[PDB]
Every structure is written in C-alpha cells, then in structure tokens.
Curated annotation (Swiss-Prot), chains B, H:
Biological processes annotated in GO: proteasome-mediated ubiquitin-dependent protein catabolic process
Top-level taxon of origin: Eukaryota
Sequence positions bearing N-acetylmethionine: 1
Compartments where found: Cytoplasm; Nucleus
Complex formation: The 26S proteasome consists of a 20S proteasome core and two 19S regulatory subunits. The 20S proteasome core is a barrel-shaped complex made of 28 subunits that are arranged in four stacked rings. The two outer rings are each formed by seven alpha subunits, and the two inner rings are formed by seven beta subunits. The proteolytic activity is exerted by three beta-subunits PSMB5, PSMB6 and PSMB7. (Microbial infection) Interacts with HIV-1 protein Tat.
Induction: Up-regulated in ovarian cancer cell lines.
GO annotation, cellular component aspect: cytoplasm; cytosol; extracellular exosome; membrane; nucleoplasm; nucleus; proteasome complex; proteasome core complex
Keywords linked to the UniProt accession: Acetylation, Cytoplasm, Host-virus interaction, Nucleus, Proteasome
Lineage: Eukaryota, Metazoa, Chordata, Craniata, Vertebrata
Primary subcellular site in the record, as a coarse category: cytoplasm
A UniProt-annotated Pfam family: Proteasome
Protein name as annotated: Proteasome subunit beta type-2
Source species of the chain: Homo sapiens
Family note: Belongs to the peptidase T1B family.
Gene expressing this chain: PSMB2
From Swiss-Prot, chain D:
Superkingdom as given in the UniProt entry: Eukaryota
Glycosylated sites: 30, 181
Annotated protein name in UniProt: Proteasome subunit beta type-1
Subcellular location: Cytoplasm; Nucleus
Gene Ontology biological-process annotations: proteasome-mediated ubiquitin-dependent protein catabolic process; proteolysis involved in protein catabolic process
UniProt xrefs under InterPro entries: Ntn_hydrolases_N, Proteasome_bsu_CS, Proteasome_sua/b, Proteasome_suB-type
Keywords, alphabetical: Acetylation, Cytoplasm, Deafness, Glycoprotein, Host-virus interaction, Intellectual disability, Nucleus, Phosphoprotein, Proteasome
Clinical disorder: Neurodevelopmental disorder with microcephaly, hypotonia, and absent language: An autosomal recessive disorder characterized by microcephaly, intellectual disability with absent speech, severe developmental delay, short stature, and hypotonia. Affected individuals also manifest aggressive behavior and have hearing loss.
From Swiss-Prot, chain E:
Residues of the active site: 1
Name the record gives this protein: Proteasome subunit beta type-6
Localization in the cell: Cytoplasm; Nucleus
The organism of origin for this protein: Homo sapiens (Human)
Section covered of the full-length record: 35 to 237 of 239
Main location: cytoplasm
Swiss-Prot record, chain F:
Tissue expression pattern: Expressed at a low level in colonic mucosa. Up-regulated in colorectal cancer tissues.
Species name: Homo sapiens
Domain of life (superkingdom): Eukaryota
Descriptive protein name: Proteasome subunit beta type-7
E.C. designation(s): 3.4.25.1
Full-sequence range covered: 44 to 263 of 277
Catalytic reactions on record: Cleavage of peptide bonds with very broad specificity
Length: 216, 196, 204, 213, 203, 220, 200, 196, 202
C-alpha cells in the first residue's frame, strides 16, 4: 500500500487419494522486477501439514517464524498431540482476522494443506480472514487461471492418483507461466502423503511457443 | 426557501405566495410580487434560485404573451404548462440549469381549472393542491386533512388561512405577509393579502 | 443515486395472445408524494404500450420525443408501427445521447399488428434491446418485480390468469418498497380489448 | 487504502410455522467475479432448538459464529440452563452493537423455536435490531425472496383464499421453488441449499441441488 | 515490452520482445512489435498499444503517399521526422516510445529514437520499452564499435534475452529483423533458441 | 459474459454464453452475443451491452454498403480496421471488448478488439470477464491445425468452463461455425442449465384482486 | 419513522408508525417503535434502528437501577437527562437518534425530547421522525389542551395517518398509547388501509 | 442562529433571549428558557451548538453553585466570568470544543454591574452592551445610536423594544417572543416577556 | 545510490557508490554507504538516509552487546536476522533497502539482502539502490560462478561504474571493501580509477 512490497503470485493445490500436493513458483517480484529468483514460498511445518504464501513475502517470513516457533513449542511437550491441519488453518484464520480487526493487516494470502490421520485437507486463508476448505485451491491470478483446470477435472472425477494430480498442477503451473505476468519459470512442487511432507524443488515447465510464427 | 401554495376549486384555483424577498441574513422589500401575470387566465409562480425566477418565467411570459397577441386567442394552461416544461427541460442539462420550480394556475373556458406543478428538473404533474419550498414540508398535511374535492371559495380561503397560520407558527422563517390571488371564470382576481 | 429520485416501477408480461403492462401511479421527490395520478404507460399504437420509469423528466421527455418521432414515422409511411421497429427506435433514441444520457429504462409491451404474436422488451439507460418472451422489469424496485414475478409466471396464460398474476406481482412487489407504490395500474392488451384497470394498493 | 470488507454473498431464509422453523441456506461464497467453493454451509446448529443463518462478509460471519457459539457455551454452564431463542437474539443484538464503530458487516437470521414450542425467527441488520417474524430471508437475494413469501406466507394484498396455516409440506415446497427462482435470477445463487429444519422432536437437514452456474 | 535496434554496418538489426499485458495478464503472448511501414524502414512500438499503431498506419499512409509522390525510396529521417511531428503534436494523449530503423539508399544504417515525450535523436544502438531499463549495463558494456551482422544478431538476441528474463512485463519469443540492402531477413527465436542463462543457486 | 473463438483448418468457431446482468442481477437470460456483420464475418461482444450492439450495427451497415460498392465479398481485414479506427477515436469511452472472425479470400482468421482500440491477430481469443475462466482450456487442450468437430467441442468446453465458475455466467451456449462454404450460426448448442420445476398451483379464478375501476375499449 | 406525542388534561398520547427502511428497500411493516421502559413511562425511536433500540434499552436498565436504588419511581426529567448525558458523550461519533421520554411522574405528564445532538427539551407536543413535519402541521391544527380522550385519539390517528400518507419513509401500522396516573395502555394496532377505508 | 442581548445600566444590567428552540426546518416549544439561574446575582446566557448550551453552562452552574454553597459567600461576576472563560478556553483545543458563546450578566455589591461577553473561542471582554447570533448583526447599531452611558430602567426597556421590533421587522427568522430579565441590587428580577 | 556485494570465495567483496541527493542536488558528493557494524560484518545502506543509519548504529548497539555477551564473533545471519526484525517491525516508516555482508568464521562468505519491505534472503551477489536497476543485465550476464578476489574486485568496480554512469542519482567515487579472514581491505576509486567506457558517436 505504501511501498512496492516483495510479492509472489500463486500457490495452487489439489488433494488426492493419498495426500495433497501444492505448488508455487520461486519469485520475489518487486513490482514488475524479478528481484529475487531463488526464494522458497513453501513452508514445511510438522510432518502432516504444509503451508504456502501468495502475497507479501515479508509477512510470510513473519508467519514462518511464528508458525515455526509455535509448532516446535507445542511439539516439545512430548505427549503426542501434534497439530492437525484443522488447527493451523483455524489459528491462521484467527491470526489474520484479529490482524485486520486492528487495521494493521497481513497482506499475504496463503493456502495450507496436509494429510491428517484419516484423510487429506486443503484450506484457504485470505488476507481479510475469508477462510474455507475446498477440493482444489489456487491463489491470486491462479484463482482465475489455474482454478478452471482444477475444477474441471475434479467435477468429472473427485478421485485422483498422485501422478494425475502432480501432472495436473504441473500443467496448471505451465498455464500460469503462459498467462500470468508476475510468474517465473522454475517452481517448487510439494506433496504431503502418508509418509509425510516432502518438497521437490525446483522444477521447470516445458514451454510450447510453436504458435508464434503464425503472426503477420 | 420561499413558499408557494395553490388549491384547485371546482371552478377556480387560488394561489398564494410568501411576500418576502430575502437576502443573506436580512430580508429586502416585502412585496416584489412573485406571481407573474400571464395572458388573461393563466398565472404562474416561481421560486428557487434568486436570479432565475425573474429571468426564466418572464421569458415564458414573453412567449405566451406573444402567442396571444400574435394569433388572437390565448393558450390553454395545459399548453402553457407543457410549453414551459419543454423550455425548462431543454434548458436543463445543456449549459445553464435554470433552478426554478414552478406552479402554474390556470383555467380554460371549456374545461376545468388546472394547477400544474413542476420541480427544478421540469417534471410536470397535475395536482388538486401543490406546494413549494421548505414551507411545503409542514403545511401540506393540512391540505390533506381538510381538502374535499369540491370546496366553496370562502372555505378554501379560510383553509388557506389555516395553512398560513400553521406556517406562521412552526416554520422558522419570518413570512408575515402572503399574496393571494383567486383566478376563476371572470379573469384573474386578487384576494386581500393575508397578514399577521 | 439519481435513478432513485422519483421512484417509479413498470413491468410487462405475456401469456397467450394478450400482454399485460403495469405501472405504479406515484410521482414525487425522495420522501414526498406530490401527486398520485402520473402517466407512465404511454400509448403509441392501438395495441402497443410503452412504459417508462426512473427520472420523471426523462420519462416525459422521451415519451413526448418518442411520440414525435413515432407519430412522424407512421405519418411518413402509413401503417401501424411494428413493435420490433419501435424497439429499434427507442434503441436509437436513448443511444446517440449516450454522453449525459436519459435516466430511464422503457419497457415495450404489445402485439404484432397483423399476426398478433405478442412480445415484451426492456431497455437500459443508454439503450440495449432485451427481447423477452417471459416478463420484463423496470424501475427502482427491480428485483422484487423479478424474483417474485419470476416465481409466479407460468407460460401460455389467458387474460384472466395474466390479469391476476400481474396484479399480485405488482401489489406485493411495490408494497415491499418505500419510494414506489400507492395505487397501481394494469393494462391488459388482448386481441380485441384493452382491459385498463387500477388497483387499490397499500397506499402508504 | 485497504477496504477491510468484501461482499462474499449468499442468501439465507428462515420460516416460522407453528412447530417448526425452516432455516434455509445457500452454498456459493464468492467475491469479485470468481467463486471460491461449493460446500460452505451458512446455517449453523447453535443448540438443538436454535439454528442461525449467517450471510455477508464470510470471515466476520465465521468469527461471529465462533463468538456466539463460545458465549452460548459460556452461558450454559454458568447458570446450568441452555439458552432460549429470544435470549440468543438479545445477546446477538448486543454483540452486533458492541462493535458498532467498526461493524460486523453480516446479515444473520436466527430461526428455531420458542419455550412453548411455536417457531420464531429473528431478523437482523448488521448493527443489531431484532424482530420476530414468520419469514424474512436475508443477505444477498434479500429483495428477491421477500415479496414471494410476503404473498405465499403472509397472504398480503390478497383476498379471501381461506388461508390455512403452514406445515412441513407446503412450506417445504415453498423453499425449493424460491431458491431455484433466485438461482435463475440472482448472481449469488448457491448451487445446493442445505435447509437446516428444526422441529419439536429434534433436527434434521435436507439438501437438494440448484442451478449450478 | 523491450525493443532493441543496433546499426551494425550498412544496414541495421532490429529486435523486439512479445507480450501485451493488461497490467498483470498477458493478453497477447505472441505479437510482433516489429512492423513494416514502407519497405526497408521499420518502426517498432512500445508503451501503450492502441495509440502507437494508429500512429503506425497513419505514417504508413503519409510515408507511403510521400514515397509514391516522389517516385523514390524515402529516407529514414523522413519517417522519424513525421514521427517527431505526429507524436509531438499529440504529446499529452500518447504513450508511444517508438524507436525506428531501416536502410535508406542515401546514407545507410539509421536508427532513430522517438521517446515518450516525442522527439527525434539518432543513435548507434537504441533501446526502449518497459523492461528496457534492466539492460543498460549489458548493452552499454558489450557493444564495442562497428560490429557485424551475426554478432549484432546474437547481441540483440541475448540482450533481449536478459530483458525478457528479468522483466515480468516482457517475455515470450523475441523477433529479430535485419534490414539490409537485399531486404528484410527476419526470424523468430522459439523457446530453446533463446540463450538461456544460468541462475546462481544453493543460494 | 465470457466469449471465445478458435481458428481451425476449414474456418473459425466463435461462441458466447447468453446472459446479460446489469448490476448484480440478470436482466435477460437469453441474448445473442454473436452479431451479424456479413455473410462471412461474425463478430462477438463484451463490455457494455449497448455499445457492442451499436458499433456492430454501424460497422455492419457501413461494411455491407462497402461490399455492395465493391461487388465482391467483404474481407475481414477491413472490419478489423474500421472497428479499430472508429473505436479508437472515442478514446475508449465505448467499452466494447469484442472479437471478430472471418473466412475470406486470403484465409480464415480472427481478431480481438480491446475497448481502447488495440487489435491482435490470434489463433484463439477470449474477451469478457470469463476470459479467465475460458483461457486455461485453450492452454491444456488446444492444438493447431485441428478438425472442426473437436474444435466445436473445444469452444463448447471453453464457454462451458466460463459457465461453471464465473459470475458473468450464462444460461446456455450458442456458437457459430464459419467455414469456407457453409456458415452455421446455431443458437443454443447445449443447455446445461434447466429451469427446474414448480410445486403446487397458486391462483384462483376471478379473485385475488382489489379492482377499483375497470375500463373496456374495443378495437376493430 | 414518524412518531408523535402530545399531552393534555388526561395524560399524553404517544403514537408512532411501524415501518423500518434500509435506505430504499424496507425491512418490516410491523416494528414496535415505542419502548416500554416500565409500566409508568415510555420512550420512542426515530432512526438508527440499533442506536435508538440500544439506548432506550440501556435507559431501561439505568432507570430500573434507579428504581431499585432509591425505592421511588424515576422522575421523567431524570431519565431524559441521563439519556442526554450518555448520548451526549457519544456526540460526533455518527450516532443518530431522537425520542420522546413521556410518562406520568409526581409533577406532570412529562414529555421530554432527547436526540443525538443532546437537545433535551421539555414540550407540550412533539413529533420526531423522518418526514414528521407533516405530523406537526396536522397535529397543531387540531390540538388544544381542553380535549377529551376520543378526539385526541382521532387527532393522533388522523395526524400520523396523513404523516404516513404523504411521506414515503413511513406507514405500516399505527400503535397508540395514552399514559396517565396508572401507566401506559394500548388502544390501537390499526394499519393504514383500514384507516383509509374508515375515514374515506 | 439564536439571539442574546444585554444592556448595562448604571446600577443594573438587563438581558433578553429569543424564546425559540429551533430544529432542522421547524421550531419546537418556544420557552426552553436559555437564561441559566446562577447563585443569586449572576446570570449567564448561552447559544451556539444545540447540545453544548445545556451541557457546558449547566456545568458552570454546578461549580459556581458549589462555590457559594460550599464557602458561604458567592462569586463576584468577574471571577465567574474568568472561571467559565478558563473552563471553556481549556476545554477548547483538547478533545471536544464546546461551541458556545456566552453572555454573563452580573453585579457585585461593592462594585458596578458588569456584562461579560465571549465568543466560541473563549476570548473575554467587558461591554456596556453585547449581542449574539446572526441577529446581532443588525440590532447592534440601535444600541449604538441611543445608548447613553447613563440610562434609566424604563428607557432601557423601551430601547430594548426598539431593538426587538427591528429584529422582528428585518431579520428573517421567526423570533416572536423574547424573555427579559433585569438584574439589579435586589436580586434577579424579571420583566414580563415581550411578544408580538 | 547503488550497492553491490559479491560472495567470491571464503570472504566477500562489497561496493557502494557515493551520492546523497536531495531530489536533484547532490548534498554529499563523498559519503561512505559502506559502514562497519562489528568487525567483519558490514552493512550497506540505500533508499533513505536518516532512518537507515539509525538502524545501523542501533544494530551496532544490539550486535555489539550480543557479541560481547557471547565472547564469540557473531554470524552474519545474526545481524541480518535483527535487520529483518528491526526493519520489519517499523516497515511503514522506513525506506532502508540495506544489503549486508561479512565473513563469519563458521560458514564463510555470506551476503544477505534486506529490501525495502523488510525481509531476509541469502544471495550470491546482492544489489540494491536507486541506480541498481540499470545493471541487472550486466551483473546477470557477467557473474559466472566461484570467482576470485581480483575479478570480483574489478567486477564490482565496473558494474558500479555502469550504474554510476547511467543513473543521475548515483555517481562520484566508488568504495570497495573485501571482507576476508585477514580483515577488511577497503579502498576507493578516485576518478581515473573508474573504468570509463566509450560512448557511441551519433
């Protein structure tokens, strides 16, 4: 609002039989300037939950140190009882609504996901506090562009294997490379399964510029 | 912030203005009479912006007066009302919005008496009784309570004195005298001014 | 706003070979009702009524302007006006004064003058033809007159059922509004009659 | 500089019969021109006999249901007695008013039934003004559903139809047709209304789809 | 939006990126900001999109009518002159930082710059557009003197590759066009043809 | 109010949803957005609902005056340039994000016209808000030089992907297929949105009215 | 909203309409716009539907605390005064209300008028509301102190009948109250249409 | 937009308010008396913002009344005037500007009668005659033309009737009744209210 | 205002230009935007001027007190961490895009970037300032991998020479500082020492 904040663009994710996969590009765009290339926007927390960020990255470093400190703090009480991704979603919701309630708001708009004891989870937490659950999410312009490819396949079959979901978000991330202006080539794809959180970065997009030479 | 009132009788229509020419803080000479004499049987009234009342409605008086003393007969008040609605409505949005709101008392011979009404946007409507200004907001229910559709002349005059004594009592502006004219099938008459 | 100045609310709906156009007889400033009789349903043909809403100086201005160009059109070429053509003519009356437009949304209700196939149309401020075979809605209290009259209208209705449903749609629509209502008016246009009627409403 | 409200949309309805209260809902929360999700309920089961509907800004609707839920629990074992319905309406009136100067931009409707058993429904502006009714949907298609069940429930502007009291079959068929009509005509439609319906023996919850666009 | 044009020797070598962003959405992934106006003289276009090609076909009209009126091929200074006039007189309504090039038979390689305010200067290399601020160091450091056609071809190619790599409002394929005596020899660089540069990691 | 169009080996396939929503309420549930200009050129329309109408009546009328002045069939380049130059000099006050396509003596091709007057030759275009809901389905499953039937299925899947997750959605898809020899302007292609049904009759007969004054007037 | 109140030789009539707008769309046709703070006084509401409802609700709390604390019926000037104190110390915060505080006490019929600016005046008659000056006109034409009970009721019914007829932001029903030395009673719940057919 | 007036005699000072409690468009009950009773011999008047007149000056009445019925004797009007100037002047800029302008008639026993004056900024000055409101702008020259420094009581009352009949004639607000109180060496004595 | 800092090997090589403009007037032709904070860790400063050195001596206070509290030389990650905190908490009042460097004994060469919004990333080369937008092409193209001290010395030298040549709010002498194990070896480039590049003439 006051300055050209350092942003990202999109953390798009989909759940699948198994776990949930979220993906984001590593980009530190300083207002139409890719000032920071190798910049991870995918936070790992305790072994059954993940976390992204789309908006301001400085507020995401604030959230990675308060989420990190909170989850190690309640992690070292022993007695089992780690955070289900219920509680990271709800705590992040109350943190942001209690943050805009004093008009000093966090500006990033993330999606947290994770595989709980029974089934997976993919929840959206907005800049304003608009929080919900969905079978497939996308943030920023991905919510305009990756979101149709996600809620087309999932209206046909709401059941995905891991390779179908992984190729699905790779293809959607290629679409955001094609259309979104604040988007960069390489991206981290990141999946939480029964065996836990793992982050496979960075990847690339096989570009298709074969329609270019038909312009006159 | 002035005050215009009219009541349509069965064979007449009477209008009354407030006889106060205002200023920033003070009032000027009272009389300044707002009711502009039309041809013989039409009579319009004008308040609003101080400087468009004496300008626009006198120009309408020029054109209707030219119509009568150009082609013999005069206008019916319907054609005069739609005439000045046309002229204000097309002088509205162009370059200089004439901010006046008109009453137009009148009668034709072979139809009834008519009291036309329009805002400063020149939206015209017939009315059995109409009002204007801020004083319209409190006095109009007394013409709701007592106005029969058929009313004699002196009953309408003392009803009009009820409206002016209420307007004298509650409304915050000093409006002590009111100019009253009954027009009917013998031409424009003028009732004695109501003072306090 | 400026559309909420004089209130006003017209609609039109058709079943069988009749249509039904309906207005609310009310005119005044935002809080004040300076009169009850106010012409909003302007006849143009024998069986083609145009109904207007919004700012009252624009509904009399393009009502009389449309009677000018319409009347001169049927004088230049002797026949009753085909109503699709009149839709095109108000479409090129509200437009071409696009900059500083007229603040009205005229609906057009009626019959083809030789085949008696009914239709009803609606336009926006700057003039866009919405041809409609169900019902059209104009005025301040739009979505009530939607909403409810989309919840009432069945297809292929004779004039007494259409009579009854536009009566209920108008009364319960404008009752749930502040700046509209206080006695409404319904014109039924059959292929032989104009059942013109008023309706005692919640006049408050 | 920030605009701390958006309008996430949604229209919720409640009807008070004589032993029931049909608290309808919709599903699609959405702002700007893109929809977010199609699962989201808006009728929340407060007690066994009170159901709220809650439409408007969704985050503040959500926090408001957390506050009225947690303070219902704060009541219930401070007096060893559950809430009534009118007391829910009163304390939600003072919760909505208590933050006036940065208000809860939310249109919420509290259905449920009274102490004696007859159903009641309390309507609210976003700053808090409760009236008990037998209808009044609220929030996005407020001015669309209202004139139908001003007529098909209140029987206003309507002569001698010999009007009967409502029931769980006439009013059941009166909620689905108004939401397919508003599914046609509103933009903030909903694709599957989840009618939290309240009765004397308990509570059930019927769901049926809509125009999905 | 990034444009390069380098006068090598005899003729010139153009170059333009290809995006048309509506703020933060690429409305046209594949556009040619290179455009011919007569035969040899090409104008490029930057800044806005709607005004600058109204200027481009307006000066195709005026330059074509003038060239057929003289029965001679016109100079590039002619086209840049009526770019100075046509862009200068409407300077408060147009965002058109066009930089033009071509081979007149009289002089040789000419590259003129008509920036956003609207004027005319002659330059050896020209540069202009949104991303054309991120490569003044590289173009200022690498361009030596009197280079040839293949090394200005790859010079414009990797300069525009830097500018499309770093700007967010610039990307896609890049179009080169080498105006010379024997006509234009244009081509595109389709994906792998872009000289991709390595990004420094671990960090 | 999403709009799309795809070029293919024989021709082009336009397509639009049919709903016009003033404010946040649908004013009309079935309107043609695929406007005639010419027997070989159909345009489209988005943005202001009236400005697209008037700009394509003007370019339709002026263009077919031009074509019967030349005698031959009108080309699609001159429609692009008349929409460009006439839509530019009103400084973008006309909001008409329309696309237009045509089969011509040169080749079947389409253009997009942004409301400020910027034109783009493209193989595939999307105007309106539903652009975003219908561009991604031109980026996973679009192939150049493709046959007519899965291009029709492609554009129906694009507009159908602008139906289901946009609030400028439409009732039903209509799409035109402009080929070399035949034109196929087909109104609605698929209707994925039924009305539903009502439950229970409502009215009496000659009741449920507060009649104050009747008036009957014969005509013939 | 158009309220109205006037005192005479037998207590004071308080009448009001029953509609509650939301700018132009209207919410309810039946709103209890007279708050019964105890069975000896009343209190009206004239805009800002949660403001006025909250502050006469809270006035009912404070006056009941006065009833418990000093074991007397509260004087009406005390209730109007403390209302003017609290809504005075929220002046300028966008607060907008206005009310009668009528009710018999040990000195008089009462009828104070307290609004958002903090006027807090006594009166013989008032009518606060949106339009409401219509009510002033018609009420002050038929008002006298020497009225009996029935044409006072007809003065209120005709008064805010015309004030709901001419105004747009009013109507619905009319409730009417006649408080005297026993407490308030209710004499009406008539709507506008039955008054229209009742009085032509 | 109300009206306060005062005239200092040789052994008295008389004040008169306008007896009109206004509103947006209408006037409420006339009486509402603006002159607030101080201890025995002081008498202040207050107009300005509707809601700070009844609040601030009554609080001053509380503190001065507490001073008299705390420490025996009452204040001289000098100390009461500088007291309320201090309280308004330090309640001026802080959080809630009390927008009232005061007259303060009074007299001490062993000094003359005093009529203090202040604006809404609490700048205090003695005056042999002072006025307030918009009605101050036209009536103050009549107290310039006729006011001798030594004037009898009935001459000052009929002079005050000259000022009120001029204020009745030219000033545009309906101010029909005026409340008059003469204070002098026997205590606060009030003359019959002037009406028209 | 243009700052460079390149991690070569083992240690780092800083670099900063020298102007302090009051819009369109060089108020200080010769300033050192390089400044020490402890011994090896240097912070630079860009953007505004008044706030950023209040941050610099504030973290000289906190970092010096912490370093004497541990009796160990502190990491560069410590100083960049309290730059993230000290600049993040006051983010709506400060224009301080500082990029810092130094040699901790534990890790080695570290160069962190704390941009205008206030955060912390680790980079091989960092860059920041007013003119530090005109040389992303040159620095992006020339910096290869694992360079040595003399070629990062001349690399930072001619990169800052490009940025002072093209920006109007950047110029004067440039200051280099090569943090290593044996301490800082700083120098200036006085006029002719600037690698002047030829301008093409049209």
């Amino acid at each position: 609002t006051q300055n050209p904040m350092v942003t990202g663009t999109s953390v798009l994710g989909v759940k699948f039989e198994g776990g949930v996969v979220i993906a984001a590009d590593m980009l530190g765009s300083y207002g139409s300037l890719a000032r920071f290339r190798n910049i991870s926007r995918i936070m790992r927390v305790n072994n059954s939950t993940m976390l992204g960020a789309s908006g301001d990255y400085a507020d995401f470093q604030y959230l990675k140190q308060v989420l990190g400190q909170m989850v190690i703090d309640e992690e070292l009480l022993g007695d089992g009882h780690s955070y289900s991704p219920r509680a990271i979603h709800s705590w992040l919701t109350r943190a942001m609504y209690s943050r805009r309630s004093k008009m000093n708001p966090l500006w990033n708009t993330m999606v947290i996901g994770g595989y709980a004891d029974g089934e997976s989870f993919l929840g959206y937490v907005d800049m304003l506090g608009v929080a919900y659950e969905a079978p497939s999410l996308a943030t920023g312009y991905g919510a305009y562009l990756a979101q149709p490819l996600l809620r087309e396949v999932l209206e046909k079959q709401p059941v995905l294997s891991q390779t179908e979901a992984r190729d699905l978000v790779e293809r959607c991330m290629r679409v955001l490379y094609y259309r979104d202006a604040r988007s960069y080539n390489r991206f981290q794809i990141a999946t939480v399964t029964e065996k836990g959180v793992e982050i496979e970065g960075p990847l690339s997009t096989e570009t298709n510029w074969d329609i270019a030479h038909m312009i006159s | 912030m002035e005050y215009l009132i009219g009541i349509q009788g069965p064979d007449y229509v009477l209008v009354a203005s407030d006889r106060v020419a205002a200023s920033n803080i003070v009032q000027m000479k009272d009389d300044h009479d707002k009711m502009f004499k039309m041809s013989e049987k039409i009579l319009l009234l004008c308040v609003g912006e101080a400087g468009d009342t004496v300008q626009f409605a006198e120009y309408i008086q020029k054109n209707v007066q030219l119509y009568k003393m150009r082609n013999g007969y005069e206008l019916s008040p319907t054609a005069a009302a739609n005439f000045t609605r046309r002229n204000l409505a097309d002088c509205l949005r162009s370059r200089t919005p004439y901010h006046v709101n008109l009453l137009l008392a009148g009668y034709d011979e072979h139809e009834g008496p008519a009291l036309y009404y329009m805002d400063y946007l020149a939206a015209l409507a017939k009315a059995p009784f109409a009002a204007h200004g801020y004083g319209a907001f409190l006095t109009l229910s007394i013409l709701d309570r007592y106005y029969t559709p058929t009313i004699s002349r002196e009953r309408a005059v003392e009803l009009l004195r009820k409206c002016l004594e209420e307007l004298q009592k509650r409304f915050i502006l000093n409006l002590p005298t009111f100019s009253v004219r009954v027009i009917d099938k013998d031409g424009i008459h003028n009732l004695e001014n109501i003072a306090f | 706003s400026i559309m909420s100045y004089n209130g006003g609310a017209v609609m039109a709906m058709k079943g069988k070979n009749c249509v039904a156009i309906a207005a609310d007889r009310r005119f005044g400033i935002q809080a004040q009702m300076v009169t009850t009789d106010f012409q909003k349903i302007f006849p143009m043909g024998d069986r083609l009524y145009i109904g207007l809403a919004g700012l009252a100086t624009d509904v009399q201005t393009v009502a009389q302007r449309l009677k000018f160009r319409l009347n001169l059109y049927e004088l230049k070429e002797g026949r009753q006006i085909k109503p699709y053509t009149l839709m095109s003519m108000v479409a090129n009356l509200l437009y071409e004064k696009r900059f500083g437009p007229y603040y009205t949304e005229p609906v057009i209700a009626g019959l083809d003058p030789k085949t008696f196939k009914p239709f009803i149309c609606s336009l926006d401020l700057i003039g866009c033809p919405m041809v409609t075979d169900d019902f059209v809605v104009s005025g301040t209290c739009a979505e009530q007159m939607y909403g409810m009259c989309e919840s009432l209208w069945e297809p292929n209705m004779d004039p007494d059922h259409l009579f009854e449903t536009i009566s209920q749609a108008m009364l319960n629509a404008v009752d749930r509004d502040a700046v509209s209502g206080m006695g409404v008016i319904v014109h039924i246009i059959e292929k032989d009659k104009i059942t013109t009627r008023t309706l005692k409403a919640r006049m408050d | 500089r920030f605009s701390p409200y958006v309008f996430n949309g949604g229209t919720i309805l409640a009807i008070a019969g004589e032993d029931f209260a049909i608290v309808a809902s919709d599903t699609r929360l959405s702002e700007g021109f893109s929809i977010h999700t199609r699962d989201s309920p808006k009728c929340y089961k407060l007690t066994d006999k009170t159901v709220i509907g809650c439409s408007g800004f969704h985050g503040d609707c959500l926090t408001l249901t957390k506050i009225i839920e947690a303070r219902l629990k704060m009541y219930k074992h401070s007096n060893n007695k559950a809430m009534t319905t009118g007391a829910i309406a009163a304390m939600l009136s003072t919760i909505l008013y208590s933050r006036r100067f940065f208000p809860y931009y939310v249109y919420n409707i509290i259905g449920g039934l009274d102490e004696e058993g007859k159903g009641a429904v309390y309507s609210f502006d976003p700053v808090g003004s409760y009236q008990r009714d037998s209808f009044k949907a609220g929030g996005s298609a407020s001015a669309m559903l209202q004139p139908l069940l001003d007529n098909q429930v209140g029987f206003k502007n309507m002569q001698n139809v010999e009007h009967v009291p409502l029931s769980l079959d006439r009013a059941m068929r009166l909620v689905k047709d108004v939401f397919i009509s508003a599914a046609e005509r509103d933009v903030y439609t909903g694709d599957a209304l989840r009618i939290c319906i309240v009765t004397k023996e308990g509570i059930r919850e019927e769901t049926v789809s809509l125009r999905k666009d | 939006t990034t444009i390069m044009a380098v006068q090598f020797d005899g003729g010139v070598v153009l170059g333009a990126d290809s995006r048309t962003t509506t703020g933060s959405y690429i409305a046209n992934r594949v556009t040619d900001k290179l455009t011919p106006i007569h035969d040899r003289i090409f104008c490029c276009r930057s800044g806005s999109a709607a005004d600058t090609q109204a200027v481009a076909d307006a000066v195709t009209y005026q330059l074509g009518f003038h060239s057929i009126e003289l029965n001679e091929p016109p100079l590039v200074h002619t086209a840049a002159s009526l770019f100075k006039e046509m862009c200068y007189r409407y300077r408060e309504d147009l965002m058109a930082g066009i930089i033009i090039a071509g081979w007149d038979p009289q002089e040789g390689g000419q590259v003129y710059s008509v920036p956003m305010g609207g004027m005319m200067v002659r330059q050896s290399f020209a540069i202009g557009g949104s991303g054309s601020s991120y490569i003044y160091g590289y173009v200022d450091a690498t361009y030596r003197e009197g280079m040839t056609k293949e090394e200005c071809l790859q010079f414009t190619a990797n300069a525009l590759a830097l500018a499309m790599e770093r700007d967010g409002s610039s990307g896609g394929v890049i179009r080169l066009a080498a105006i010379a005596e024997s006509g234009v020899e244009r081509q595109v660089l389709l994906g792998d043809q872009i000289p991709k540069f390595a990004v420094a990691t671990l960090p | 109010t999403t709009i799309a169009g795809v070029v293919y080996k024989d021709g082009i396939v336009l397509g639009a949803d049919t709903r016009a929503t003033e404010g946040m309420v649908v004013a009309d549930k079935n309107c043609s957005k695929i406007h005639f200009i010419s027997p070989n050129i159909y345009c489209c329309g988005a943005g202001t609902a009236a400005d697209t109408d008037m700009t394509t009546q003007l370019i339709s009328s002026n263009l077919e005056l031009h074509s019967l002045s030349t005698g031959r069939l009108p080309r699609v380049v001159t429609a692009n340039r008349m929409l460009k130059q006439m839509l530019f000099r009103y400084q973008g006050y006309i909001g008409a994000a329309l696309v237009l396509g045509g089969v011509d003596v040169t080749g079947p091709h389409l253009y997009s016209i942004y409301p400020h007057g910027s034109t783009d030759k493209l193989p595939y275009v999307t105007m309106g808000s539903g652009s975003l809901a219908a561009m991604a389905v031109f980026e996973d499953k679009f192939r150049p030089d493709m046959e007519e039937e899965e291009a029709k299925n492609l554009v129906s899947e694009a507009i159908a992907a602008g139906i289901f997750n946009d609030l400028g959605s439409g009732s039903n898809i209509d799409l035109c297929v402009i080929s070399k020899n035949k034109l196929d302007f087909l109104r609605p292609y698929t209707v994925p949105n039924k009305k539903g049904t009502r439950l229970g009759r409502y009215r009496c007969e000659k009741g449920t009215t507060a009649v104050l004054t009747e008036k009957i007037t014969p005509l013939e | 909203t158009t309220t109205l109140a006037f005192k005479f030789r037998h207590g004071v009539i308080v009448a009001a309409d029953s509609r509650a707008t939301a700018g132009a769309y209207i919410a309810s046709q039946t709103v209890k716009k007279v708050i019964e703070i105890n069975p000896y006084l009343l209190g009206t509401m004239a805009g800002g539907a949660a403001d006025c409802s909250f502050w006469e609700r809270l006035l009912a709390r404070q006056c009941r605390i006065y009833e418990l604390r000093n074991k007397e019926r509260i004087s009406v000037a005390a209730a109007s005064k403390l209302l003017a104190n609290m809504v005075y110390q929220y002046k300028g915060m966008g607060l907008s209300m206005g009310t009668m505080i009528c009710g018999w006490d040990k000195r008089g019929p009462g009828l104070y008028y307290v609004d958002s600016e903090g006027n807090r005046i006594s009166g013989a008659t008032f009518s606060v509301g949106s339009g409401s000056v219509y009510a002033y006109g018609v009420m002050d034409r038929g008002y006298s102190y020497d009225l009996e009970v029935e044409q006072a009721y007809d003065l209120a019914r005709r008064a805010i009948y015309q004030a709901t007829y001419r105004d747009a932001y009013s109507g619905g029903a009319v409730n009417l109250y006649h408080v005297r030395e026993d407490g308030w009673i209710r004499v009406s719940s008539d709507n506008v249409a039955d008054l229209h057919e009742k009085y032509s």
